Write an enzyme that holds these catalytic residues in place. Structure first.
Site, PDB file in Angstrom:
ATOM      1  N   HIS A  62       0.821  -1.229   0.000  1.00  0.00           N
ATOM      2  CA  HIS A  62       0.000   0.000   0.000  1.00  0.00           C
ATOM      3  C   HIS A  62       0.835   1.250   0.000  1.00  0.00           C
ATOM      4  CE1 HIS A  62      -3.266  -2.775   0.838  1.00  0.00           C
ATOM      5  NE2 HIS A  62      -2.699  -3.136   2.013  1.00  0.00           N
ATOM      6  N   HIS A  92       5.151   6.955   6.808  1.00  0.00           N
ATOM      7  CA  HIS A  92       4.908   6.522   5.444  1.00  0.00           C
ATOM      8  C   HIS A  92       4.385   7.738   4.709  1.00  0.00           C
ATOM      9  CE1 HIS A  92       1.118   6.150   7.534  1.00  0.00           C
ATOM     10  NE2 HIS A  92       0.565   6.531   6.360  1.00  0.00           N
ATOM     11  N   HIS A  94       1.753   9.063   1.221  1.00  0.00           N
ATOM     12  CA  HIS A  94       0.763   8.909   0.176  1.00  0.00           C
ATOM     13  C   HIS A  94       1.167   9.837  -0.956  1.00  0.00           C
ATOM     14  CE1 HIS A  94      -1.971   6.901   3.126  1.00  0.00           C
ATOM     15  NE2 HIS A  94      -1.298   7.661   3.977  1.00  0.00           N
ATOM     16  N   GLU A 104      -3.802  13.430   0.909  1.00  0.00           N
ATOM     17  CA  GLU A 104      -5.074  12.949   1.444  1.00  0.00           C
ATOM     18  C   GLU A 104      -5.868  14.125   1.993  1.00  0.00           C
ATOM     19  OE1 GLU A 104      -4.146   9.421   3.978  1.00  0.00           O
ATOM     20  OE2 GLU A 104      -4.801   8.443   2.176  1.00  0.00           O
ATOM     21  N   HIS A 117       2.960  11.000   6.702  1.00  0.00           N
ATOM     22  CA  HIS A 117       2.303  10.706   7.968  1.00  0.00           C
ATOM     23  C   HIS A 117       3.283  10.098   8.929  1.00  0.00           C
ATOM     24  CE1 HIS A 117      -1.836  10.428   5.847  1.00  0.00           C
ATOM     25  NE2 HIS A 117      -1.420  11.707   6.049  1.00  0.00           N
ATOM     26  N   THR A 196      -6.635   6.644   7.773  1.00  0.00           N
ATOM     27  CA  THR A 196      -7.137   6.829   6.403  1.00  0.00           C
ATOM     28  C   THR A 196      -7.028   5.580   5.552  1.00  0.00           C
ATOM     29  OG1 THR A 196      -5.056   7.429   5.400  1.00  0.00           O
ATOM     30  CG2 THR A 196      -6.368   9.210   6.492  1.00  0.00           C
TER      31      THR A 196
HETATM   32  N1  LIG Z   1      -2.653   6.749   6.652  1.00  0.00           N
HETATM   33  S1  LIG Z   1      -2.794   6.180   8.190  1.00  0.00           S
HETATM   34  O1  LIG Z   1      -1.604   6.529   8.916  1.00  0.00           O
HETATM   35  O2  LIG Z   1      -4.016   6.667   8.755  1.00  0.00           O
HETATM   36  N2  LIG Z   1      -2.916   4.537   8.255  1.00  0.00           N
HETATM   37  C1  LIG Z   1      -1.816   3.763   7.800  1.00  0.00           C
HETATM   38  C2  LIG Z   1      -1.422   2.650   8.747  1.00  0.00           C
HETATM   39  B1  LIG Z   1      -0.259   1.504   8.275  1.00  0.00           B
HETATM   40  B2  LIG Z   1      -0.788  -0.011   9.073  1.00  0.00           B
HETATM   41  B3  LIG Z   1      -0.738   0.263  10.833  1.00  0.00           B
HETATM   42  B4  LIG Z   1       0.520   0.989   9.784  1.00  0.00           B
HETATM   43  B5  LIG Z   1      -0.182   1.938  11.121  1.00  0.00           B
HETATM   44  B6  LIG Z   1      -1.918   1.538  11.232  1.00  0.00           B
HETATM   45  B7  LIG Z   1      -2.302   0.324   9.980  1.00  0.00           B
HETATM   46  B8  LIG Z   1      -1.993   1.094   8.394  1.00  0.00           B
HETATM   47  B9  LIG Z   1      -2.703   2.029   9.716  1.00  0.00           B
HETATM   48  C3  LIG Z   1      -1.374   2.903  10.370  1.00  0.00           C
HETATM   49  B10 LIG Z   1       0.105   2.704   9.536  1.00  0.00           B
HETATM   50 ZN   LIG Z   2      -1.140   7.595   5.965  1.00  0.00          ZN
END
Ligand SMILES: [N]S(=O)(=O)[N][C]C1234B567B89%10B%11%12%13B85%14B%1158B%12%11%15B%139%12B%1061B%12%112C5%153B%14874
Ligand SMILES: [Zn+2]
Length: 258
Positions: A62, A92, A94, A104, A117, A196
């Site tokens: 992703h 990470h 986007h 986003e 993020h 998100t």
């Molecule tokens: N764009 S976000 O940060 O709202 N969500 C991304 C994720 B990836 B995986 B874990 B990691 B942590 B949690 B799940 B997914 B969710 C946060 B990271």
């Molecule tokens: Zn994110």
């Protein structure tokens, strides 16, 4: 048939497996700058990343995640709207297929090329998994990326992406300093929202910096060479891995600045 960003498994389908997709505090949102109100109750924001310990970089199909050691208070976010201490667990991005899309959050409907993020969890809940089950479990620091001059502090990330082209691939990624990804100003907007991505849990205090960072065309082009697919599968470029703006509903966006 798992979730993703395509026609058949994208944002408009997520609600079937994750009904909270149509919830009361979903993210991202459009930030209407004229409707956002300065909040004098907000305390100063504290981004303390000097002792951050990065470990690995992972393509999870992703995005790519730069993961940190969060087994003690080393890299922490506090202040601003937050009560207590939030530990950095990962960051990470986007991004888009073109420079005019990829973020986003939007700002007066403007889409940026990308959005970073930095994900933090509230240490009062002991572990990340417990934190995501709480309305104040996470604080995500969001930073917009625009295309112009290179961000030198991003290049180390850019140069490892070759080693993690496909879903499931990881590479050692120690001694990366996330301070090099921050703009000069910590002026921000804040609102209560959600992850998100699935599971779309309504556990996030969003803190979105007003000042974007600039990255080069060459830097973002390398993001766009990543793959959603696994090794030896048909190539699907990892682009447009963003959820669009969701209904603001019964929320006010607060500004840290006048
Ligand atoms: N764009 S976000 O940060 O709202 N969500 C991304 C994720 B990836 B995986 B874990 B990691 B942590 B949690 B799940 B997914 B969710 C946060 B990271
Ligand atoms: Zn994110």
């Amino acid at each position: 048939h798992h979730w993703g960003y395509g026609k058949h498994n994208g944002p408009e389908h997520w609600h079937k497996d994750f009904p909270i997709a149509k919830g009361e505090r979903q993210s991202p949102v459009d930030i209407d700058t004229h409707t956002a109100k300065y909040d004098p109750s907000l305390k100063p924001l504290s981004v303390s990343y000097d002792q951050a310990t990065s470990l690995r970089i992972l393509n999870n199909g992703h995005a790519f995640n730069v993961e940190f050691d969060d087994s003690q208070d080393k890299a922490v976010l506090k202040g601003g709207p937050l009560d207590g201490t939030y530990r950095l667990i990962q960051f990470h991005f986007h991004w888009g297929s073109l420079d005019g899309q990829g973020s986003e959050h939007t700002v007066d409907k403007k889409k940026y090329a990308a959005e970073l993020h930095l994900v933090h969890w509230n240490t009062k809940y002991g572990d990340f998994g417990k934190a995501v089950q709480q309305p104040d479990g996470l604080a995500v620091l969001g930073i917009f990326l625009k295309v112009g001059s290179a961000k030198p502090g991003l290049q180390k990330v850019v140069d490892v992406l070759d080693s993690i082209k496909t879903k499931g691939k990881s590479a050692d990624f120690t001694n990366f300093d996330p301070r090099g990804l921050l703009p000069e100003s910590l002026d921000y907007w804040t609102y209560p929202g959600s992850l998100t991505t699935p599971p779309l849990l309504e556990c996030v205090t969003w803190i979105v910096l007003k000042e974007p960072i600039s990255v080069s065309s060459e830097q973002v082009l390398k993001f766009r060479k990543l793959n959603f697919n696994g090794e030896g599968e048909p190539e699907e470029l990892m682009v447009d891995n963003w959820r669009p703006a969701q209904p603001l509903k019964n929320r006010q966006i607060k500004a840290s600045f006048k």
